[PDB]
Amino acid sequence: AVQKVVVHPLVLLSVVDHFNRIGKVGNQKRVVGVLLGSWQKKVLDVSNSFAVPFDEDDKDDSVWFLDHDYLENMYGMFKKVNARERIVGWYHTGPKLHKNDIAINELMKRYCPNSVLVIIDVKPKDLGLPTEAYISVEEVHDDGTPTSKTFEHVTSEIGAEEAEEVGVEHLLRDIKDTTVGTLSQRITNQVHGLKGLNSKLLDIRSYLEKVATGKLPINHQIIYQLQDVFNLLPDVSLQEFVKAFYLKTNDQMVVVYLASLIRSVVALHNLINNKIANRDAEKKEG
Amino acid sequence: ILAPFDNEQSDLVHRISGDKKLEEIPKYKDLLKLFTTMELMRWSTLVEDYGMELRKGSLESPATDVFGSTEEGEKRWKDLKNRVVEHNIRIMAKYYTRITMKRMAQLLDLSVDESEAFLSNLVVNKTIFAKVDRLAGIINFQRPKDPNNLLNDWSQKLNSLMSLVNKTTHLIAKEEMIHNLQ
Amino acid sequence: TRPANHRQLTFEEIAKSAKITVNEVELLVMKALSVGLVKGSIDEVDKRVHMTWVQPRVLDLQQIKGMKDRLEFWCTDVKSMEMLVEHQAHDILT
Amino acid sequence: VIDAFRLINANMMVLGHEPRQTTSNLGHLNKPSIQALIHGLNRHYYSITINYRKNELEQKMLLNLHKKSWMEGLTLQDYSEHCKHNESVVKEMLELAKNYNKAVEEEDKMTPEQLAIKNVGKQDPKRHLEEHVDVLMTSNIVQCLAAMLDTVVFK
Amino acid sequence: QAAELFLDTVSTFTSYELMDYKTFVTYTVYVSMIALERPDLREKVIKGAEILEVLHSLPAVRQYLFSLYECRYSVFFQSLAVVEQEMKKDWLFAPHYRYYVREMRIHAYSQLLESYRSLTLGYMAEAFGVGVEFIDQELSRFIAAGRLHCKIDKVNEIVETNRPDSKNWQYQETIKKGDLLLNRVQKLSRVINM
Secondary structure (H helix, E strand, O other), X not given: OOOEEEEOHHHHHHHXXXXXXXXXXXXXXXXXXXXXXXXXXXXXXXXXXXXXXXXXXXXXXXXXEEOHHHHHHHHHHHHOOOOOOEEEEEEEOOOOOOOOHHHHHHHHOXXXXXXXXXXXXXXXXXXXXXXXXXXXXXXXOOOOOOOEEEEEEEEEEEOOOHXXXXXXXXXXXXXXXXXXXXXXXXXXXXXXHHHHHHHHHHHHHHHHHHOOXXXXXXXXXXXXXXXXXXXXXXXXXXXXXXXXXXXXXXXXXXXXXXXXXXXXXXXXXXXXXXXXXXXXXXXXXX | OOOOOOHHHHHHHHHHOOOOOHHHOHHHHHHXXXXXXXXXXXXXXXXXXXXXXXXXXXXXXXXXXXXXXXXXXXXXXXXXXXXXXXXXXXXXXXXXXXXXXXXXXXXXXXXXHHHHHHHHHXXXXXXXXXXXXXXXXXXXXXXXXXXXXXHHHHHHHXXXXXXXXXXXXXXXXXXXXXXXXX | OXXXXXXXXXXXXXXXXXXXXXHHHHHHHHHHHHOOOEEEEEOXXXXXXXXXXXXXXXXXXXXXHHHHHHHHXXXXXXXXXXXXXXXXXXXXXX | OOOEEEEOOHHHHHOOOOOOOOOOOOXXXXXXXXXXXXXXXXXXXXXXXXXXXXXXXXXXXXXXXXXXXXXXXXXXXXXXXXHHHHHHHHHHHHHHHHHHHHHHHOOOOOOHHHOOHHHOOOOOHHHHHHHHHHHHHHHHHHHHHHHHHHHHHOO | OHHHHOOOOOOOOOOOOOOOHHHHHHHHXXXXXXXXXXXXXXXXXXXXXXXXHHHOOOHHHHHHHHHHHOOOHHHHHHHHHHHHHHHHOOOOOXXXXXXXXXXXXXXXXXXXXXXXXXXEHHHHHHHHXXXXXXXXXXXXXXHHOOOOOEEEEOOOOEEEEOOOOOOOHHHHHHHHHHHHHHHHHHHHHHHOOO
């Protein structure tokens, strides 16, 4: 169905300022809007979006209000300026998914049979991506219901277009990477990976702590996946693995040795050239 | 079932199987099932249970063609024996890793010298891999391991670990969403 | 029952546990490999079985605490390596 | 490139007066281009200065572009293409090594005034080998270190 | 490179200034016995029509080549001794006439043990040259040098063979060339800058 979704910075800025301008008026918690984008093969692209009047009550999670005519006429109005765009799904800025999401998704599945839900965090505090992508599906199991509606995650990333790229480059004057080389290849890849892995393990720790003491709704799929995780850890004490590891490392170090030798030779040549060329400049002054 | 093993034979078997009118004739469906499942019998039970079953009914005319003709009967019985021993060889090479020679001859209902003669032409024709040492009666079915392959498998295992750990957390959050909302 | 380390088991153990003689045990494992219940490989000349992967199962609430403890002393290695790599290569960029 | 303009009327110029009375020197920081002068500009309209307002929230949000997940920084690549790439690089390194001394020997047999022009049509190994050295060292070091820490992060 | 460049037997030898053709053929066969191996000694020096036609008039050199090729090690030593006597007093071979010999002998030793696995040193006595003590001393002093990879046991007088990987030998050469180049480049570096 869907493999990857790509998000442009334009919709992010639109989400941010919509949240600001609607939350300044009063103490609302969640806001809703509709996205526009394009399809190609199994890859989805999001270009722009517009807001919509939405109301929800904190007293109960079964009462809420959206506007149909607003959405219809606003889509018709954006049609007259660019016909390539089309309705693809909706977004809500909630920190975490709510109970009513299934109902709203069913409500606006009429305009797009393959609606995709997107969650944007407006005040991130970590290095992770602010966007999360979900798609509805029907799940089946042993007993309880033949089918049940459930969300499933889809990989998301932030893309860029040429004009958008030059705009965001002009906007990001203060912050720019120091060097491109082993620096950006090391810190941006390895340390952040350790951070993310530790965070994930902490979250699963928290859920496991919630069980066998507290609420205790023992679920079995999580247990099956945990067994699969704990069974897949390799063993590094095997003799053959150690021998192969040593062989490959010894094979690899020779190349660095050779490159260092070449660099030393080039440095000596440069020193000779500079000294010879510069020693012949003092006598010209007389 | 007379065709030598190949991908075209395999997918033709898969397409020809599961016919609504095929169940009208159960014996040949049973033969197809026997040739499509795992490790197959030696030689005796099928020749003792289907030899006579190829004379009755109102469809045994190809069976009478296979048996009654002298030269055709001999050639096709030899071909069927070769096919079943090939199937046994393939399955025992898929599941075993190192085997004695006496057990190999025992499972094939034929002597040790014919066993090695039947595996030699196969291995020199580049259809299966096998290395037999006949000073200790050992047969080895596994290739030597290069240093690259071990680390490649290790890296693949690491990638699978990371992917499944990523998968678990989203389901964790979805499960938690519907119990502590209020 | 057996731990992840030292999962290799002999033919006679299977023969005693399943109350059958040795000559059939191979077929048994063969069947256990055919229907995909367990994944592994088997040797013949040395009478050994190398077992690799078995299906998961449900288990009570006093057993998951073992997994919780394993995560407990798993997270600390990641944290320690994080700190070591961060401190060792500080001046490469502040 | 963004500019902002406002129009003026010629009757006020008939009065011998000019618009945009000047009270400070922060209005003349950018000299106009010649093509703006070629068209109407100051005899028909006047340009005004421009500025962009920036806040911390949107700027902090916007810097997430091209950031990659924690998975991409722990993969250690295939151990089969890496040796092929090293083998490929070593051969061109060898050829440039063979070609170096020929250019080293004749560095001063010709007057240096035309020395620079001598390198206008054909490549020079000295500049063309350093990039090989750099990429090779970087790839080898990072590939070693990734496996080095991964051997102990997992079990 | 000498044996490589001496493939001009058929591409003319009009340079009669330095020497005559027969000496050229003897020199080229002498260096071909050093440089190249059996799959080429059987393809270029034993199959050449012109070199064989010339060699037909020189019984000594033909015998010296066929003895090595036909694996008659007993008669090989007489020819080796005669040849080294000849080249000791010869020009442009004297200053290292010993080194050449020290190859051929050990070369023959490496050309017999590579087929069997447990040949006793008793057989070598009547198959290679009389004297068990001489063979023992030569084998020991060539094992100690690091070449001729094999092993000898003296309590029962048995010679065993081994097959070292072609990565160890391809590593000490790299390390020693690196050491020499580093010494040279350091000397160059501190010759300048006083």
